[PDB]
Design a protein around this nucleic acid. Structure first.
Ligand SMILES: [Mg+2]
Ligand SMILES: [Zn+2]
Ligand SMILES: [Zn+2]
Lengths: 729, 122, 119, 105, 56, 147
RNA sequence: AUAUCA
């Protein structure tokens, strides 16, 4: 009977395993680790190498000598935490010594540097170690921290409390917690109705930004001029570095899509839909003046910039803007006009779809469209601006030392204090930016960890800040991800979110294994799309980048789901199939809040649709519970349980209780609350336990289902100020 | 299974390494809308020149010109299969694919003047 | 409406009246192309629309678990297996009429007890 | 020859355009030019037109797997192949009569 | 909520808390009461400064 | 309401109607532009009967044809006659108007002007929907009756 | 400057 359905008490055996593995601050640690193991290297390699060329006067010896010098950055190293005492000696440093001597719990950052030299005469370049760069503060309990592989008895000897959970830094002896910052997800197409007094009635916006590398915060607006009842309703778009909004047509022409109808094919996918097509006639009339690719680029080039007078100059510009500043996600490469044209057309399709009252205006408050910037990405943002600060100070040195041939001394070149004190400042003060000249910088990003009570400490490491439509309200999308009660009263009410117990935040994976997988599984590339040939084609996106289309999504979706539930596709990756809209969006993306749910399958030889997890797995876990071989990961790879973010939640159907919401009806207690039914035969998932919708503080409230809504909101604020033993140490 | 049927199979010479134009076999693609007919007394002549590099294609004057631009790549790739008199096939990889990429024309004594008129509009 | 393009240009067509033979044509403003009109209707406004109601009805409509089911007997195959939704035309005014899509014959039937449809 | 001129498509030579998986092409490169680089053979089966590609045994040690081909239409397009020699002469070699995609196997 | 079928205008779907506080709230009832509860806390919070300035 | 007619619900309705703003847009199902070159004979066989009368007991070959909603034409009490009269009285002698009877199944208004005419009529239909006031006072919308 | 108090 090891394949018997699971009861309601059994959901706790799964919850036990979730916490045995993840702990209460998996988000804080998993973020930092990702930044140390991967993110750090990629930051050293984006701009990385810098060169200086000294080309002569070509008069006569000692002239006519052209040289080019290189400086390259290879592997990045990072020691265990250390300290440099006054008397030279460097030695290991444990968290307790840091807190008492007010030191910083940081470790050394070391990078392989190489310095090449080249030379030519009056075209042929011919050729003629590990350096310390800074001290990076470590987050306690992370991979790099001493306390990570520490046993219980170990911690006690180290004068640390085993109940301490890590997730903070130690800067000058005070504990500091990075607060997750909530921002709107980028590379996302959103349509909004521009209010009653406006020339423009609707706008299609895309906040395009790179996953890493400079991060061009250029937002493209696709504007529908004219109001509901105004003649000549044209569509123009505001392009980065271009003062005026160019009529869509000219953009397509400048892209290479020259005749109307070839242009129309990219926007409207149904040749039948006369309604949308009539709406495009004004645009065609607007772009009638420009007839070829060249004249389109000139028209774009005319409208500066400044203007930048000269015919050859303006046409050359528009080329650069379309390549480097227009739709920078997708590609910033050359020959990708086809990709960026179809995207613009997908945007115009969405702009018109909303204006034709077929789709709703985008919910600016949908949680699925929000990201959380944790300790990882926060340090990554800071380290970028701090490493480009160092990179361009070495260059200033290479000029100073090639002028006087003063022997390019390494220690004089790299200023360690740049990155060391640059991070120490942020973490200490809290103005997340460079440096003692901060504003606007975002203060309160780093703050001193609440140590009043143990619960107070826990709830501080799960706190979310939202800076600046109706944000304070509890959204439906906040279900299972954020606590409905734990929020402040006054000013910050509903802008300070607290994570539910089972909530985790996507660390950010690689998109290529999925893009490579897709093409191989029937995905026709956008570069060869012919809308009227395959008109029912499901459009496939990976991080707001339209990669192509697929003819039988039904089978593809099942393959991709089996890929995740096996482990082949990472479980933190979100994949959604909106059948009605004919779309398949995939997210490898960092910052997405997810929750784990039980998987339910129609798949059962014996009877109905039943929860994959059986009483045999439950005992298989409680066997491992008695041992203190079957972990949470074990349930995850056996595809019994899955991770679902808010966007994916949209397409699923969840049962609250397993047992109570599974077998149909073939007296009743009056004292129990009135409950609904398991009418659904469609159930894709089941709720592990509904109490998990609550955060750390609300989870101490006895019978919160018997209190008036705010009385609960009050307790999850007061318990933070209740006295008790905060730590055994 | 058993083959009660017959199959005609030809040997494929996986691309010969050494070819005079081993290096360049390219695809020139025209959209059907362009309606280019190779069998035209007019299109007897044709010149293909790099524009200084998009390719420029032109017939005798008075005839349309096309511009050729290079398409983006992918994991799969295209090969050109040709058949010798003997059934054997020789395959050659496509170096580049260009979408052409021509004229109209009727774009002279205009464009700049039309935009100006449009400006006399606002 | 349903409009045509110029063969040769692929550019759109503008209506021209042939004053002499009192007939409607479609001219291309990029080349010398002309073609006679199919219908006399050139422009249709449509304020009180019905196009959007039964949108996105992919044969995979049954594979959406989010969609609710009913035991209503189909007008065609008489199957008591169907998924239902409301007018997908995202307007304020819009009635709460239901559209049922057969999990066998795929025919779209409504609950409208005021009027009779075919979409 | 005539500089900047294009060559002879007038002959109406026909060729086929086939999309091949990257992995297969990788294998093909392995074949020696000296050998003549015979990668394998193409099979045309009747009882409906079916075309498949099979690698030579030399290429891999196993049972050769056939790669089915999906025949496709010319599309509303005219595809022509032009070659450029080391000499940089340009010739209009042939027109693409048929398109096909070799599926991975 | 994801526990409901689409186009559900039923009392149970659109936030009708059927139960007494003595009986207890279902997870759905609990979250909807929480949404409704949060609204009041928002105006209590805001009104406080708006009301203050009116007085001045 | 006026002293006397204070309890008279029908008097209330009369003022409600005389004050609540009504535009040609609120009654229109769709407007259409057709090429109907013979003013005397129509390419739309439906309309054939409307001509046969609004002729018995020179102009543009381009026709503006709009369909009105019977249900809408009733809630905001209106007649084809009175609607048509407004259009006729708006454009004076530079627009030739005909209309289907209140009895007749479909509700139609056929309009013609008095080289280049396509854009001209698209302006006339915008003027018609947006600027033509049928009943009511401007700025006054949703008028409710209250006891 | 953050957190908090009624
Ligand atoms: Mg008090
Ligand atoms: Zn034309
Ligand atoms: Zn049926």
């Amino acid at each position: 009977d090891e394949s018997a359905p699971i009861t309601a008490e059994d959901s706790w055996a799964v919850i036990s395993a979730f916490f045995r593995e993840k702990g209460l601050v998996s988000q804080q640690l998993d973020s930092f680790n990702q930044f140390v193991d991967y993110t750090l290297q990629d930051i050293i390699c984006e701009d990385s190498t810098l060169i200086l060329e000294q080309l002569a006067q070509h008069t006569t010896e000692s002239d006519n000598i052209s040289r080019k010098y290189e400086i390259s950055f290879g592997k990045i190293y990072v020691t265990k935490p250390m300290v440099n005492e006054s008397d030279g000696v460097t030695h290991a440093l444990y968290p307790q010594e840091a807190r008492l001597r007010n030191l910083t719990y940081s470790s050394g950052l070391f990078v392989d540097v190489k310095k090449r030299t080249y030379e030519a005469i009056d075209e042929l370049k011919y050729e003629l170690g590990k350096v310390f760069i800074g001290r990076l503060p470590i987050m306690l309990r992370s991979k790099n921290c001493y306390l990570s592989e520490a046993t219980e008895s170990d911690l006690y000897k180290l004068k640390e409390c085993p109940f301490d959970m890590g997730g903070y830094f130690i800067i000058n002896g005070s504990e500091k917690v990075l607060i997750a910052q909530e921002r709107s997800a980028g590379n996302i197409v959103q349509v909004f109705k521009k209010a009653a007094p406006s020339p423009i009635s609707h706008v299609a916006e895309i906040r395009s930004a790179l996953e890493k590398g400079s991060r061009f915060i250029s937002t493209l607006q696709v504007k529908l001029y004219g109001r509901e009842g105004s003649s000549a309703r044209t569509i123009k778009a505001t392009l980065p570095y271009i003062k005026q909004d160019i009529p869509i047509v000219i953009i397509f022409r400048a892209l290479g899509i020259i005749p109307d109808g070839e242009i129309l094919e990219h926007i409207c996918y149904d040749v039948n839909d006369w309604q949308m097509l009539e709406m495009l006639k004004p645009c065609v009339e607007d772009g009638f003046v420009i007839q070829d690719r060249e004249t389109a680029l000139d028209f774009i080039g005319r409208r500066g910039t400044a203007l930048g007078i000269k015919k050859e100059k303006r046409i050359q510009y528009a080329k650069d803007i379309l390549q480097k500043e227009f739709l920078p996600h997708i590609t910033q490469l050359e020959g990708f006009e086809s990709r960026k044209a179809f995207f613009l057309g997908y945007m115009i399709n969405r702009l018109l779809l909303c204006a034709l009252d077929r789709k709703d205006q985008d919910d600016r408050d949908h949680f699925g469209k929000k990201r959380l910037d944790l300790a990882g990405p926060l340090l990554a943002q800071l380290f970028k601006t701090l490493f480009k600060k160092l990179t361009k100070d070495i260059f200033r040195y290479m000029q100073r030392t090639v002028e006087e041939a003063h022997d390019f001394n390494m220690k004089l070149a790299i200023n360690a204090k740049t990155i060391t004190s640059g991070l120490k400042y942020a973490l200490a003060t809290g103005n997340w930016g460079e440096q003692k000249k901060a504003m606007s910088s975002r203060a309160g990003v780093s703050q001193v960890l609440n140590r009043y009570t143990y619960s107070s400490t826990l709830s501080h490491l799960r706190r979310t800040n939202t800076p600046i439509a109706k944000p304070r309200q509890l959204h439906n999308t906040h279900w299972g991800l954020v606590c409905p009660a734990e929020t402040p009263e006054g000013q910050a009410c509903g802008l300070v979110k607290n994570l539910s117990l089972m909530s985790c935040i996507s660390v950010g994976t690689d998109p290529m294994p999925i893009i490579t997988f897709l093409s191989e599984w029937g995905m026709e590339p956008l570069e060869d799309y012919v809308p009227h040939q395959s008109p029912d084609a499901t459009r496939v996106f990976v991080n707001g980048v339209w990669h192509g289309v697929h003819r039988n999504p039904a089978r593809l979706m099942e393959t991709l789901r089996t890929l995740r539930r096996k482990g082949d596709i990472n479980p933190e990756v979100s994949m959604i199939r909106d059948i009605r809209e004919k779309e398949l969006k995939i997210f490898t993306d960092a910052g997405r809040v997810y929750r784990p749910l039980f998987i339910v399958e129609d798949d059962e030889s014996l009877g109905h649709k039943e929860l994959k997890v059986r009483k045999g797995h439950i005992a298989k876990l409680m066997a491992t519970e008695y041992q203190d071989e079957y972990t949470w990961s074990s349930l995850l790879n056996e595809g019994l349980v899955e991770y679902i973010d808010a966007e994916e939640e949209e397409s699923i159907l969840i049962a609250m209780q397993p047992e109570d919401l599974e077998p149909a009806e073939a007296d009743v207690d009056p004292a129990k609350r009135i409950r609904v039914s398991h009418h659904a035969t469609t159930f894709t998932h089941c709720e592990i336990h509904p109490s998990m919708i609550l955060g750390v503080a609300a989870s101490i409230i006895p019978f919160p289902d018997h209190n008036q809504s705010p009385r609960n909101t009050y307790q999850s604020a007061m318990g933070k100020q209740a006295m008790g033993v905060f730590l055994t140490n | 299974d058993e083959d009660p049927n017959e199959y005609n199979e030809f040997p494929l010479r996986a691309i010969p390494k050494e070819d005079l134009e081993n290096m360049r076999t390219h695809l020139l693609k025209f959209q059907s809308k362009k309606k280019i007919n190779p069998v035209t007394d007019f299109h007897l002549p044709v010149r293909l020149h790099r524009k200084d590099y998009p390719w420029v294609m032109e017939d005798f004057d008075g005839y349309n010109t096309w511009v050729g631009s290079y398409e983006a790549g992918n994991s799969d790739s295209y090969v050109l299969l040709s058949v010798e008199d003997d059934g054997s096939f020789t395959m050659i990889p496509a170096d580049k694919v260009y979408k052409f990429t021509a004229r109209n024309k009727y774009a002279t004594l205009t464009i700049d003047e039309a935009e100006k008129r449009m400006d006399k509009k606002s | 409406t349903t409009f045509r393009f110029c063969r040769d240009c692929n550019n759109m067509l503008y209506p021209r009246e042939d004053k002499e033979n009192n007939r409607l044509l479609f001219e291309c403003r990029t080349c010398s192309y002309v073609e006679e009109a199919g219908s006399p209707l050139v422009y249709r406004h449509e304020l009180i629309t019905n196009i959007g109601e039964t949108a996105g009805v992919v044969q995979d409509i049954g594979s959406d678990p989010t969609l609710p089911r009913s035991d209503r007997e189909c007008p065609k195959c008489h199957s008591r297996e169907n998924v239902f939704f409301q007018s997908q035309q995202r307007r304020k005014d819009t009635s709460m009429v239901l559209f049922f899509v057969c999990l066998s014959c795929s025919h779209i039937f409504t609950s409208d007890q005021k009027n009779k449809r075919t979409q | 020859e005539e500089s900047l001129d294009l060559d002879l498509e007038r002959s109406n030579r026909q060729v086929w355009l086939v999309r091949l998986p990257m992995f297969l092409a990788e294998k093909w490169r392995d074949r020696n030019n000296l050998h003549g680089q015979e990668l394998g053979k193409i099979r045309i089966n009747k009882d409906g037109s079916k075309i498949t590609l099979l690698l030579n045994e030399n290429d891999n040690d196993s049972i050769p797997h056939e790669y089915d081909l999906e025949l496709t239409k010319k599309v509303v397009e005219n595809e022509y192949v032009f070659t450029e020699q080391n000499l940089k002469k340009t010739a209009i070699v042939g027109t693409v009569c048929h398109e096909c995609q070799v599926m991975p196997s | 909520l994801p526990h409901f079928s689409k186009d559900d205008y039923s009392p149970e779907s659109k936030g009708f808390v059927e139960n007494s506080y003595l009986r207890g709230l279902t997870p759905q009832e609990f979250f909807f009461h929480a949404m409704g509860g949060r609204e009041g806390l928002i105006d209590t919070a805001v009104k406080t400064a708006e009301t203050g300035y009116i007085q001045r | 309401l006026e002293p006397g007619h204070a309890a008279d619900q029908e008097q209330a309705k009369l003022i409600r109607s005389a004050i609540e703003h009504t535009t040609l847009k609120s009654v229109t199902i769709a407007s259409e532009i057709y090429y109907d070159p013979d003013p005397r004979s129509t390419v739309i066989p439906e309309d054939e009967e409307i001509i046969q009368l609004h002729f018995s007991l020179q102009q543009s070959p381009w026709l503006l044809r709009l369909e009105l909603d019977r249900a809408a034409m009733n809630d905001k009490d209106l007649t084809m006659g009175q609607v048509g009269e407004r259009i006729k009285q708006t454009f004076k002698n530079d627009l030739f108007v005909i209309w289907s009877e209140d009895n007749d199944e479909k509700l139609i208004i056929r309009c013609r002007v008095v080289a280049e005419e396509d854009h001209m009529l698209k302006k006339i239909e915008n003027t018609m929907l947006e600027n033509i006031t049928l009943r009511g006072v401007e700025n006054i919308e949703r008028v409710v009756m209250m006891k």
